[PDB]
Design a protein around this ligand. Structure first.
Ligand SMILES: Nc1nc2c(ncn2[C@@H]2O[C@H](COP(=O)(O)OP(=O)(O)O)[C@@H](O)[C@H]2O)c(=O)[nH]1
Length: 159
């Protein structure tokens, strides 16, 4: 270590969408076919940020101190996208008002099984005033893009 800043980030969404593998891809560049956390440091002006990222298999305790979150669904499972409103609600009830939130559609490699079209997801994100990006934890597609967008925006909000 040295790190100038510790940013707590929470992953939230239905079981089976890819949260634990988003965590393992970003922090240790690995994929696998109660509550846990992992860390990874990035550098900007030479300023070093330690991302402390969480997921679950304590709601007040889980959200406390979080400065960012990824809201995650599965682009192949309609129910996971419908359930995003509920997870956003739980987040709003329990998180700091200045928390930075990003919508993520995972499993983008399952091209032929898509049920959620990207314009419909973008429409929802804009309504909730969030950025939206599609990822593949399996193929690594856009994983660094999603986490770095989140971390740089938290730094800007903080500064
Ligand atoms: N094809 C594909 N499968 C994935 C992807 N991400 C996760 N999975 C698989 O989907 C299942 C659930 O993922 P997991 O990380 O355990 O979901 P969680 O319950 O949200 O933590 C596992 O069998 C993963 O290997 C992905 O991007 N593409």
């Amino acid at each position: 270590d040295y790190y100038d800043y510790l940013f707590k980030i929470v992953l939230i969404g239905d079981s089976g969408v890819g949260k634990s593998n988003l965590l393992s891809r970003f922090t240790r560049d690995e994929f696998n076919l109660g509550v846990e956390f992992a860390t990874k440091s990035i550098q900007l002006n030479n300023k070093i940020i330690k991302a402390q990222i969480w997921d679950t298999a304590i709601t007040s305790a889980y959200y406390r101190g979080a400065v960012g979150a990824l809201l995650v669904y599965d682009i192949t499972k309609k129910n996971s996208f419908e359930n995003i409103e509920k997870w956003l609600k739980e987040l709003r009830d329990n998180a700091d008002s200045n928390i930075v939130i990003l919508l993520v559609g995972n499993k983008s490699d399952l091209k032929h099984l898509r049920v959620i079209n990207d314009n419909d997801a973008t429409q929802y994100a804009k309504k909730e005033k969030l950025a939206f990006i599609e990822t593949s934890a399996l193929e690594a597609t856009n994983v660094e893009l999603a986490f770095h967008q989140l971390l740089n925006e938290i730094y800007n909000v903080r500064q």
